[PDB]
Design a protein around this ligand. Sequence first.
Ligand SMILES: *[C@@H]1O[C@H](CO)[C@@H](O)[C@H](O)[C@H]1NC(C)=O
Ligand SMILES: [Ca+2]
Ligand SMILES: [Cu+2]
Ligand SMILES: [Cu+2]
Ligand SMILES: [Cu+2]
Ligand SMILES: [Cu+2]
Ligand SMILES: [Cu+2]
Ligand SMILES: [Cu+2]
Ligand SMILES: [Cu+2]
Ligand SMILES: [Cu+2]
Ligand SMILES: [Cu+2]
Ligand code: NA
Ligand code: NA
Length: 1034
Amino acid sequence: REKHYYIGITEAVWDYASGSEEKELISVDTEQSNFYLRNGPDRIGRKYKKALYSEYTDGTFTKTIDKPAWLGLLGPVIKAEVGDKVSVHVKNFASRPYTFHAHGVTYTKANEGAIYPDNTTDFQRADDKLFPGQQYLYVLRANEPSPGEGDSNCVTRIYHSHVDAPKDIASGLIGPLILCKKGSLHKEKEENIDQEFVLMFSVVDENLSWYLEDNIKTFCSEPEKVDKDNEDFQESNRMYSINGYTFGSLPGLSMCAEDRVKWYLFGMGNEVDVHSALFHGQALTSKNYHTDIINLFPATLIDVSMVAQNPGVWMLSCQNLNHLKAGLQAFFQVRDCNKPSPDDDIQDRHVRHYYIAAEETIWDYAPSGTDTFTGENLTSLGSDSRVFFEQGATRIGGSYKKLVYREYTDDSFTNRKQRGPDEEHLGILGPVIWAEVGDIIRVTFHNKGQFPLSIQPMGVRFTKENEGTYYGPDGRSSKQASHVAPKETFTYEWTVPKEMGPTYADPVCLSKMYYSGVDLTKDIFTGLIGPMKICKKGSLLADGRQKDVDKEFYLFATVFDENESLLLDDNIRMFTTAPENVDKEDEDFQESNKMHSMNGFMYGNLPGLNMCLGESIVWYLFSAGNEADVHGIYFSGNTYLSKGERRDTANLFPHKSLTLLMTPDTEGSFDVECLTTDHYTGGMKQKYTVNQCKGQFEDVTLYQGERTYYIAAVEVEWDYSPSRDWEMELHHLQEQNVSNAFLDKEEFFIGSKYKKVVYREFTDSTFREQVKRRAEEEHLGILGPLIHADVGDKVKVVFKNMASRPYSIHAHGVKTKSSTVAPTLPGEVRTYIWQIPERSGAGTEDSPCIPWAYYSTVDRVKDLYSGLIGPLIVCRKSYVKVFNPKKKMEFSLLFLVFDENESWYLDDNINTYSDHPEKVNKDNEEFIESNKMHAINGKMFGNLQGLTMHVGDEVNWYVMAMGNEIDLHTVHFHGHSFQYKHRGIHSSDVFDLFPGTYQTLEMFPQTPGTWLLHCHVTDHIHAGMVTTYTVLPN
Ligand SMILES: *[C@@H]1O[C@H](CO)[C@@H](O)[C@H](O)[C@H]1NC(C)=O
Ligand SMILES: [Ca+2]
Ligand SMILES: [Cu+2]
Ligand SMILES: [Cu+2]
Ligand SMILES: [Cu+2]
Ligand SMILES: [Cu+2]
Ligand SMILES: [Cu+2]
Ligand SMILES: [Cu+2]
Ligand SMILES: [Cu+2]
Ligand SMILES: [Cu+2]
Ligand SMILES: [Cu+2]
Ligand code: NA
Ligand code: NA
């Protein structure tokens, strides 16, 4: 079915906050909104000149088709069904060159609308740059896997300009393309769906817009003291918005109770774009799983479905606490249209009544005064721990006055419900609030602190009179529920209707949470946080434990920002010997109050994660905070299942929660730790213990095949950019000069070459011949050799350390005989034995082959960054049936900012490479930045080669991330979409990666060309995390 859209690009002034306040917002005052919104001498305000896409009736562009009010600054909605040919007539009426570039969809090289080194010429680069007054017809076909069999009828894709994509997007050229299964549309709207909304969550950065200078000229009434480097000024140009509406100003999100709604969501921007969308008071699903928070990163694409309930005005907010207080909030309205309630139904409903007080403790984040992993004193000189535990003149130390939720037996708040051995691990968390689907939950909350507080659940149903957070206008008079003053008591009633419970496909119990909502951005960090567990009807025993489960554990990961605590002033007075001298604004004082922790515990002090070999364990993980809260919680020694996928590292973000199923199969003391580099260093690491508890057999676990690999750690000179031709050509084509902070030696920087240590394969146990890398492995770059294994194998890794200090080799996923990994000393060879049982391979919904990172354990952080990293691929044991071949291609991609500041080889590289090493200050911020190498397989700006395939190939891409808080990587392939999970049931062209995320993506190349492959985060594209792959004709 052939379709036509006419879309025009025009400059026009956008108003980020048409609506004012008026509005009563979560955790925002006049000051905070003025910061971003108010015009001044040095400040632009809320109106910016932007370039926007608009829809026209005709190839003449003589009249507009009106955008829906809620679309805001997004371009008009394009819809396509599988098999449609879509012609997008685009004309540019702005003052600089621009394009139209589509994600969901198949285009030839002449129809891509993106400029980069691709060996194309003339008849083919006309799409890539549309000057002022130029016009182009973009021919798109909905011919990839499009939406998968496990995807919704309609899914979210995007389009945007791609001259310099990040700057063009920031300028305002972004819109939605909704891609649907044949033929789910009627009159351009999905059948049996009452409402379709599209929302972009973005920190729209007007410092990056092309129109920044134009906007300084127009709105700054004195264009003098404005240093554009000024941090406070840059920040005032960051508009924390949905569809370009800030501070509750998004209009037109209305619907009726019982409406079947689709929300098409995406994130856009840079590293600060860690979003956590909450639709307050509503019940959401995605891919037939219950969702409570929707996380969105740059170019994250997702769609969710909901049936609107509970007539009223409801908040849509980002729960990234930094974003929330910068105005990222909107309202939507659910009207009572007298549509019929499917009035249910439920028998033997129970009341779960809890008695909970907020009260003061002195919370010690590490009672032993040591890092339990190393035995070291936390305040020992030169240690990383000392930053946080040092106590003296302007330094609080390891113990803080906190406010904490605590369970009592009754309404007199006299006798604690004492915390069992099962609940010792809870630590700082309040008691678990649990319920089954159908139940009523009552919570009698008594405030014994000096600040007003509340209880706000995430993921149960409350009437407006029971809501824990205040905002409006939404027709509420009484503040009682949202403001429980210092000696008052309030009894909350919430309910648990089935839409708020697990779906068919979900686990038995969902992890959720509750917290104080009087001021969310301070209260949680004050300590007012606890777990909630919501379960299928009939699944719990009388005490709340799940039926076929031996133990249940709750892990809350966060950077506890004591600077944000309500009690920061009491603590300054109580704990510093010189409170008058404390400057709260000092960066180093701030850092010292950031306690990187798990349940309030740090550096191995978390007690009570103890269990027996073979027991059935459920882990409920969750987090809260801001963009610093990107967590990869790694359980060494065991894997878990979740939604039929096997992993050993769970990614968390603000307000995210997960349920993981584990049956531990080896005795010992293991690490549960955050892999995120800064967090591990900062103390976010703990022990869990698996004990025998009886006996009994000597030797019973799975080995059949044996494979042996000879691998060494070799010191090597590594070049992140051995050519600069790709980079320079990209820039010629964009018409931009621009310097490079990472590669330009300047006066005294290192450049692109660094001494690193890397894993390399050898032919036998003599280690006299390095394996010569084939053409199909050229792409590996810094990665170690592919280690392949089948379920049931034993893998012998014979490891030689040919480098200058101790290192090791260990894999995620894999089973070993003990919890300790032996170091290999320089010149020593050591055999490591990796068992590959069923639990180290695909879960029932994984593709047949799954990737696991292997890495060194001696110093997790510094060994990674020094260069030791590689892919272990584990495949399901080969079926007995197969008659003929197929022709399978494998590529492994590692998205990582190599921080050469943390390399063991930094001093050698200072002395070897800078023209004047005397001049080098390691604490200088510009030098630090020069050594952050933003790469794919340790190569930048198109130097990653060997990604070559043919039309009709079957390709597995094994994508991986590791690293720091900042290593959020959203992997986008131009020219093809991919699929994942068993049988390629899900489809996309952006895959979200974080430290410890590993995934098989299947691709079926069909359009020839040379295609861009890049992370979609602004900072990372600009810094070089980009290459191409080439699809040749059959
Ligand atoms: C750590 O070191 C200091 C000595 O500067 C000492 O006062 C402190 O008690 C030590 N603590 C532990 C738990 O070893
Ligand atoms: Ca082109
Ligand atoms: Cu894109
Ligand atoms: Cu956000
Ligand atoms: Cu929920
Ligand atoms: Cu973390
Ligand atoms: Cu940190
Ligand atoms: Cu990235
Ligand atoms: Cu693209
Ligand atoms: Cu791109
Ligand atoms: Cu960067
Ligand atoms: Na200015
Ligand atoms: Na502003």
